[PDB]
Design an enzyme around this catalytic site. Sequence first.
Site, PDB file in Angstrom:
ATOM      1  N   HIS D  50       0.774  -1.232   0.000  1.00 35.05           N
ATOM      2  CA  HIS D  50       0.000   0.000   0.000  1.00 35.05           C
ATOM      3  C   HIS D  50       0.808   1.287   0.000  1.00 35.05           C
ATOM      4  O   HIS D  50       0.229   2.346  -0.141  1.00 35.05           O
ATOM      5  CB  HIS D  50      -0.929   0.018   1.210  1.00 35.05           C
ATOM      6  CG  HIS D  50      -2.001  -1.031   1.165  1.00 35.05           C
ATOM      7  ND1 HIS D  50      -2.592  -1.453  -0.014  1.00 35.05           N
ATOM      8  CD2 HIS D  50      -2.607  -1.725   2.158  1.00 35.05           C
ATOM      9  CE1 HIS D  50      -3.495  -2.375   0.257  1.00 35.05           C
ATOM     10  NE2 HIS D  50      -3.538  -2.545   1.568  1.00 35.05           N
ATOM     11  N   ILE D  86      13.972   2.247 -15.773  1.00 33.63           N
ATOM     12  CA  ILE D  86      13.457   1.296 -16.723  1.00 33.63           C
ATOM     13  C   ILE D  86      14.516   0.253 -16.958  1.00 33.63           C
ATOM     14  O   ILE D  86      15.698   0.556 -17.111  1.00 33.63           O
ATOM     15  CB  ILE D  86      13.163   1.993 -18.049  1.00 33.63           C
ATOM     16  CG1 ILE D  86      13.042   0.973 -19.181  1.00 33.63           C
ATOM     17  CG2 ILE D  86      14.262   2.993 -18.366  1.00 33.63           C
ATOM     18  CD1 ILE D  86      12.510   1.555 -20.466  1.00 33.63           C
ATOM     19  N   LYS D  95      15.938  -3.779 -29.604  1.00 36.32           N
ATOM     20  CA  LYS D  95      14.910  -4.035 -30.612  1.00 36.32           C
ATOM     21  C   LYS D  95      14.123  -2.781 -31.008  1.00 36.32           C
ATOM     22  O   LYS D  95      13.292  -2.848 -31.902  1.00 36.32           O
ATOM     23  CB  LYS D  95      13.937  -5.097 -30.111  1.00 36.32           C
ATOM     24  CG  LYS D  95      14.498  -6.500 -30.127  1.00 36.32           C
ATOM     25  CD  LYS D  95      13.414  -7.513 -29.801  1.00 36.32           C
ATOM     26  CE  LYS D  95      13.922  -8.947 -29.814  1.00 36.32           C
ATOM     27  NZ  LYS D  95      13.141  -9.819 -28.894  1.00 36.32           N
ATOM     28  N   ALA D  98      12.822   0.568 -26.214  1.00 35.10           N
ATOM     29  CA  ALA D  98      13.048   1.585 -25.186  1.00 35.10           C
ATOM     30  C   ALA D  98      12.123   2.772 -25.347  1.00 35.10           C
ATOM     31  O   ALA D  98      11.420   3.107 -24.396  1.00 35.10           O
ATOM     32  CB  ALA D  98      14.496   2.058 -25.193  1.00 35.10           C
ATOM     33  N   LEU D 132      19.827   9.147 -25.898  1.00 32.86           N
ATOM     34  CA  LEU D 132      18.512   8.549 -26.093  1.00 32.86           C
ATOM     35  C   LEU D 132      17.460   9.356 -25.371  1.00 32.86           C
ATOM     36  O   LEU D 132      16.529   9.866 -25.992  1.00 32.86           O
ATOM     37  CB  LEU D 132      18.476   7.108 -25.591  1.00 32.86           C
ATOM     38  CG  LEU D 132      17.451   6.139 -26.218  1.00 32.86           C
ATOM     39  CD1 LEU D 132      17.154   5.061 -25.185  1.00 32.86           C
ATOM     40  CD2 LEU D 132      16.142   6.746 -26.714  1.00 32.86           C
ATOM     41  N   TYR D 133      17.617   9.477 -24.061  1.00 30.11           N
ATOM     42  CA  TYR D 133      16.684  10.252 -23.259  1.00 30.11           C
ATOM     43  C   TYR D 133      16.516  11.681 -23.796  1.00 30.11           C
ATOM     44  O   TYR D 133      15.426  12.247 -23.716  1.00 30.11           O
ATOM     45  CB  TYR D 133      17.103  10.263 -21.779  1.00 30.11           C
ATOM     46  CG  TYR D 133      16.983   8.908 -21.101  1.00 30.11           C
ATOM     47  CD1 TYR D 133      15.768   8.255 -21.029  1.00 30.11           C
ATOM     48  CD2 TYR D 133      18.084   8.281 -20.533  1.00 30.11           C
ATOM     49  CE1 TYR D 133      15.646   7.015 -20.411  1.00 30.11           C
ATOM     50  CE2 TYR D 133      17.971   7.040 -19.904  1.00 30.11           C
ATOM     51  CZ  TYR D 133      16.738   6.418 -19.850  1.00 30.11           C
ATOM     52  OH  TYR D 133      16.580   5.193 -19.252  1.00 30.11           O
ATOM     53  N   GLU D 134      17.569  12.260 -24.363  1.00 28.96           N
ATOM     54  CA  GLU D 134      17.432  13.565 -25.024  1.00 28.96           C
ATOM     55  C   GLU D 134      16.417  13.497 -26.174  1.00 28.96           C
ATOM     56  O   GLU D 134      15.524  14.335 -26.272  1.00 28.96           O
ATOM     57  CB  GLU D 134      18.793  14.078 -25.517  1.00 28.96           C
ATOM     58  CG  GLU D 134      19.525  14.934 -24.495  1.00 28.96           C
ATOM     59  CD  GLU D 134      21.041  14.824 -24.569  1.00 28.96           C
ATOM     60  OE1 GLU D 134      21.598  14.427 -25.622  1.00 28.96           O
ATOM     61  OE2 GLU D 134      21.673  15.156 -23.549  1.00 28.96           O
TER      62      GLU D 134
END
Lengths: 170, 171, 169, 169, 170, 171, 172, 171, 170, 170, 171, 172
Positions: D50, D86, D95, D98, D132-134
């Site tokens: 919870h 992640i 693949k 992402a 990537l995140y950019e």
Amino acid sequence: QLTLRALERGDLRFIHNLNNNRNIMSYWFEEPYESFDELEELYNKHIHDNAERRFVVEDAQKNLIGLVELIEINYIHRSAEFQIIIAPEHQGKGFARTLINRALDYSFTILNLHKIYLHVAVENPKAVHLYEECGFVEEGHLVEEFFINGRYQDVKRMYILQSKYLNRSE
Amino acid sequence: MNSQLTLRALERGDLRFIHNLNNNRNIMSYWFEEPYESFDELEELYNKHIHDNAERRFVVEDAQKNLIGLVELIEINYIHRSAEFQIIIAPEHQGKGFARTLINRALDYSFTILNLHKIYLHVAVENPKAVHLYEECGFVEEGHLVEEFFINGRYQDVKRMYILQSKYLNR
Amino acid sequence: NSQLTLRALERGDLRFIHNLNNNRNIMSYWFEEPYESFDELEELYNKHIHDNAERRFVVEDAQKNLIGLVELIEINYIHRSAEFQIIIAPEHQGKGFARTLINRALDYSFTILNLHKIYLHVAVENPKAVHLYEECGFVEEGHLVEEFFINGRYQDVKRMYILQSKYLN
Amino acid sequence: NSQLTLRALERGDLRFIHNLNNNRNIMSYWFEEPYESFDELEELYNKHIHDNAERRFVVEDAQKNLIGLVELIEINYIHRSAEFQIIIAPEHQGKGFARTLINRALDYSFTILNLHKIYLHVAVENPKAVHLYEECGFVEEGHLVEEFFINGRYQDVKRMYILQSKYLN
Amino acid sequence: QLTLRALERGDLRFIHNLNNNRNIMSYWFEEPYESFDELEELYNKHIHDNAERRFVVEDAQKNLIGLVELIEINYIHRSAEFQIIIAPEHQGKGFARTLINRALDYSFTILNLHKIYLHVAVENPKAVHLYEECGFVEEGHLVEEFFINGRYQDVKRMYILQSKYLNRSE
Amino acid sequence: MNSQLTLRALERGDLRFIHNLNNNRNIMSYWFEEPYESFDELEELYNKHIHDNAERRFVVEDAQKNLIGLVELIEINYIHRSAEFQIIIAPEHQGKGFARTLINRALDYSFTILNLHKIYLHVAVENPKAVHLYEECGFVEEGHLVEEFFINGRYQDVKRMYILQSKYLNR
Amino acid sequence: NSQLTLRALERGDLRFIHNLNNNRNIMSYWFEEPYESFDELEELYNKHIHDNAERRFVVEDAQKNLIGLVELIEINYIHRSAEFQIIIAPEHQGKGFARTLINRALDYSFTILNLHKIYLHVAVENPKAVHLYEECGFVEEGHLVEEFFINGRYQDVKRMYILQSKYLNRSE
Amino acid sequence: NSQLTLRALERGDLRFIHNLNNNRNIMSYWFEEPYESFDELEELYNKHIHDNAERRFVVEDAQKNLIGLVELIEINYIHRSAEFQIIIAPEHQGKGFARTLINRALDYSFTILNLHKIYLHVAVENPKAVHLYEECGFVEEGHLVEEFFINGRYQDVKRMYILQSKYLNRS
Amino acid sequence: NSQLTLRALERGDLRFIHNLNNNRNIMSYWFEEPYESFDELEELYNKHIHDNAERRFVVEDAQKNLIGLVELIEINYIHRSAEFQIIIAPEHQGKGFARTLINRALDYSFTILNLHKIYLHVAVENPKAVHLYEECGFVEEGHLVEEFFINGRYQDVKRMYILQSKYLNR
Amino acid sequence: NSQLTLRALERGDLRFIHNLNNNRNIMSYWFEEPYESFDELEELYNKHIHDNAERRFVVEDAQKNLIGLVELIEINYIHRSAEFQIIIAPEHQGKGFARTLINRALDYSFTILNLHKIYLHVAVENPKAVHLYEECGFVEEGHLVEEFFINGRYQDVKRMYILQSKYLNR
Amino acid sequence: NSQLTLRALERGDLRFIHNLNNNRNIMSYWFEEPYESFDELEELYNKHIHDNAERRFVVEDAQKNLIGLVELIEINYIHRSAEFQIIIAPEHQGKGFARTLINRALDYSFTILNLHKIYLHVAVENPKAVHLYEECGFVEEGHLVEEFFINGRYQDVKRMYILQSKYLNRS
Amino acid sequence: NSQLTLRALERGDLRFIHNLNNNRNIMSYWFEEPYESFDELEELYNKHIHDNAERRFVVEDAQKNLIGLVELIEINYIHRSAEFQIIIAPEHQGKGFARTLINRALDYSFTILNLHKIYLHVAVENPKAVHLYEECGFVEEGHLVEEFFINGRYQDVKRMYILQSKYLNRSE
């Protein structure tokens, strides 16, 4: 080839078998035990507790090889005591070094400890020479530390440091 | 033979066998100084004191794994380094000459591992063969306890007999 | 008769106990706490597993058929006395088993448990039961007036007793 | 990519989580409490069932193969922000999954959960992850010096963030 | 032929089915309930408790016939409320009298109660005439006692005494 | 037909179905005003509040026992004699014309058994067909709640609509 | 002596118990559990208020001076036996009290408790005590060898006993 | 000087123990568990009041002034060993109590508790103290390298021991 | 004598009960659990506060000096009987209070509690009390042989009784 | 200034902490659990007394007036870092105590606790404190955008840091 | 006379309640559970402090003298009914408070708690009281035969009720 | 008014809370649980000290007179809303305080709590209150019909609301 896996409940009967022959009183979080049910009850009680970490060793076939223990872990002094038990049916296959190295790699990288010490019975030259081979050095010869098989026996205390383990090649 | 026999710390599963033993006997049976009669009482007692270290019990089985008997240490005092030993052999293994081997095994554990100073035990005055047995194993009388135990209808006397660790290790 | 054995009661025996306490027409108790249903009885059984005030023994025969129950209650370790009762299954009543049963109980209460007095209650309106307990060596010590409500009518029980020395000699 | 779904995590998924946290080379936590063994993790899982501070979602595909984990932690309902991470299984890494995954998380954290800011940490010595995140719309806001001991060496992470308004517009 | 057995856990699903159709809010020890799991939880909580006693009725074939309840048992005033529910598939077989008599015999012999009362909806002449047939007499006509099926409904309170039940033949 | 449908008090076993329903929806789901997302959270919530009477839920199935939907009353106040009704139909039964039958059933239970004075409910302003539906069943708007609920990415307005017991019983 | 009375021990009394178990230098025990501090003991008292394995009595005189303690431990109601011991406060020894106390302990044990046998242990290195209990009807049933580690060495103790019929019926 | 006495620790002594573990600039332990505030200690004291792995005595004088603490920890009743530590208050150091107190703890350990080995730790960086213990019968068995992080860095400590057989056959 | 009151017992009164049970010369119990020390009795008192098996009433005068104890035990609500005992303080015996006391107890058990039988044990070797109770309407129904160990010998008690109707038709 | 002491926190000090967190103008937590009332904070205090995540030190002068709070949170014993915050009483700001305070904290975390990094958040819009910390050896490592809602608008904090070696090689 | 007031019961009021249930010579109940001693009641009060099936008000005056108790018990929030009882202290009976208090309890029951029926019990053997209640609006609905064992025998009681619709449309 | 301050409610404050919930004659509630006696309330307070669904504040003036209470209940942090209400002690009404309080409640809710919407209910039979909240920026979103049984009949109440951007940014 060889792997280390955190210990879990399934593994207890294997632990229990190991803690026979070499015939000291065995312990779990400093509480002593002789029987499966005793152990199982201790296991369940100290499942949260972080003073000690255990890792079963299996091979690529899942044969249970031996156990790596760390106990007395202290995160102020950043130290721990290590011991290792190989099952009689797997001694003399050269495995013990690989394992000691994996214990040290875990302690000194993931746990970020400063120092690992251990104890070997003085009346066991081979092990002493082995830990010596692996980086350990004697810091003590502890007189009559333990009553084993009918008498109080001496043991070497041996230690290695983190910067030594990780940086001695640089 | 008698190297063939092995001791083994007791386990929940061994309780049925214990209960069977403590029936023949027609005394009350204790588990950590607490009386019991039915298997359920015992299982409940076992679980309560699974962690207590005033008593330690070993099951005696052979190579063919038959259940032979019980080796029992109670009243373990870790200051005075003493304990009381009791042994119980199943009926069908009494009189096959295991006792002296089991006695010796218990003495071994008490003195080479548990590091005790003195093991004592009780035997019925009314059973001198048992008394002459223990004496042969190194036990010596230290007391004739008058009307000590209510057993099968009346109060009986028992010999308290002991043996010390220094005498065993130097045997 | 020699085939009959006594056995400390266990959890598994609770069904047998429950069936026996069906017909009684009175409220069966367990450590002085009343109960009708198995579930009630089981919960009680767990609660008093270590209470020494009462002790129960199942009687079974050669091929382990359940014959009946032997029961000691209000056991007192100071004054050394218990109340005692016995129930034999309908399908084994009237075979000569009562005597043997009574005895084995006394034997227990006097050779193992080290009690001094055993008492019991028999319905007055049960003539032959009273004569039975006399044969085994009980003596009336009280005629208890309007003691128990039974079949919608307060009734008289005799209370009957026997002593350790009188069993053993 | 469109086949991928998100599912609140359940007890059954603890094996999958445990296998994923094997290789990490760091001490995996659960509601900020460290754990190595399944048994450790399970006991933790029961304790914080919870606790709203963290929320977890399993990714599975067409025929329910377990792809990876999406995780929000240090969730704060006053300031409206969470840390986010992640993990994709080895046998599904590389693949094109992402992006889709990142998105679905943002979607959750911004359309359902009503959060304002999402931040995350990427190892500096991980060039392409940062890029990537950019691409998904994160911006560095901190270069955190010697923050985490990893492979026996304190290392630098960038902390990167994106806002509700920038996702939605 | 017919038998009364103290209620137990196995019997709950039968209870639960009974407490549908006639469509009041049902209760267990005055706590209300609508679902199996609710009931089961109430059952387990009040297993010790003696304010209420229940008896399933089965035949010589173990068909579950109906339920005899006693509630509000008070051992000072030595009274109780009784109700009875027969399963729809067993009404009209003349069973209800036999059962009422068994309830009264239990209450007045084994429990040794002084008085059993009950309630019948005024808009149900048949039941009233039945309990009347069995010894019961009206002590009250309780105006708007219960809201059932859309409106507050009247019910007769009816009672019988122990000496009456047991001694009215002497 | 629609007599064919039946209400049934919820049971542990019905939790999987509930969980499946509350997924489609992309709001947070509450159980006794407490939020949840995973089946385990729900089972844990269910058991905690199994005895609480501020909410009551019925599963709607048919004669062939298919699972149709959920009828739900929350916030039951037994002083002011009020409650909030919600209904949820599974996707594959939406648009088969059961709603008005289920609404009527819930109104029935609330007013003929639970003896309440007022049932109210919320509908999205942004879904007027649903609003014109309830109106047809006797509901009347008492409020346009501005930006009341955060739903799927933004704050939405909802109509609060009610119906009183005296109007139902006299329909 | 005519003045002396016994009272079942209660909580107030713990400080006194504790003062007694100091300068005698066995390890002391409550219900077979060891203790040195007051607090330790207090915790043990509360834990064992139900327990009937041991009964304790304070001795007070007519002025309510705390004279000593009478303990019974290891009480068994199958074998109907128990182990007795007594402690007098140093400032009250050699006032003739000890016998009177021992009679009271034997009287409670054998009337009110209806016990069958009462035993005790005396250190062999205490001739005077041995003689005392011997005067009170106790007889030797054991010379327990190296039974206890007391003062840096293991020590012999006499086990002594008396039976209920003896106590009650000896003058009959 | 014999006026000095030892007294099993009591809840009321905790303030004094806390005052003592201020100066130290190590982390303090109660039963292998660390603490800083009096409130942590008092909560630790109550948890471990029955635990037998540690033993503590407050040292006071004739005038009941608080001198110091004598601790035994890591007590093992199989191997019959224990670590000993002593703390003297600042204002009572260098008055010649230490050897007396050392000797009182040795006395308890070997005459009452029936141990076999007492060992302790002392800073390599304090030879004064190492020579003090040596004079009292202690002998070095180890030079523990970087054992304890103390006030800024890792430090070496001598581990010194002494055996019961030797304290009793003493001058 | 007419002023003597009876009051339900409560925690405050325990000292008095404790003092009274002091030199009984047989063990005192509380809900069938034996006790010696006040502390023991207190714990016992808290444990059985809602236990109905036993009920206790303190007796006081109009000046509120503590006179005696009235005590009903082994109360059975099915068969409607109890055992009765009474203790008068050593400093108030020989004042003719007993019968008033005895009565007030009867009064409570028969007119408030709805009991049908009261019985009680009296040492055979105390013939005065035997006749005392006879004088209040008790009647022997048993001569119990060797029931209780008292002063080092098993003794005989009479058990004596009265009914609810014999009290009220008088 | 040299007299300022640091003392582990305890129950007595809670009033002070409560007063200090009063007009913060953002919510105060305790082991990451939010609180407003003393009573709330007290319960919280008892709940986390043995929790190591956070540690707190009260500051007092040689006269024992309550000066400030030193507070370490989010303590991780693997990676050896913590977040640090400090609050000075409104009646003791502007006296040049901060740096002494800042220091004593560093001192404890780096020489007693064995930590490797200390970091801390400072409102961007409070440039004075930004430079203050710079002046003690802290260095920006992040400009955190819209981190915290404060006074009705999400604001930017700098996060700033120092290492164990830069403290000690100075 | 309007000076009289009603006050939700408080732990401190218990003595007074106990003084009241002395005289009665019935057994007293707190939440359908019987008691005799103040200690039983206080332990019952704490158990049932949150229970809503009963409600109690202490009646005091301007001078804060304790007049009486007003109880509502067996409260049912589905059937909207409850039993009412009143107790006046001995020394305040026959001073004309009862009707006022009756009327205050009726007021609370119907204006605040939103009930539908209040009923009570009165001894058949006290016609004075039956006529009192009748004058206040109560009507007889039952003659309960031998309902309560009271001071020596079983007694009949009138059950009388009054409805909310009628108290509100009142003179 | 310049003097007035707010303080999170604590245990001492319960007597005051209780005195307030008397002569207003709704049934009152703590965390949706009903209560009439002090003791009742106290029990509820302790039970709900952790619970964050509701936050309460006492108002005091510079002399520490207890002026009134500000409550927030039904607090949700998904929908970011809450229900507000206020009670002033009869001996302090008509002193101009009410507005200042309402601003403080809106300020806490919308800055420190970062809530999105604050609603409240006013009885329709209270024109003056309606006007007040209306002055403070609240607007009607509902006329809830027969919502509450108050004083022997069911009663209408206005639901009113204000939004966070309104509150903060209206002057911008």
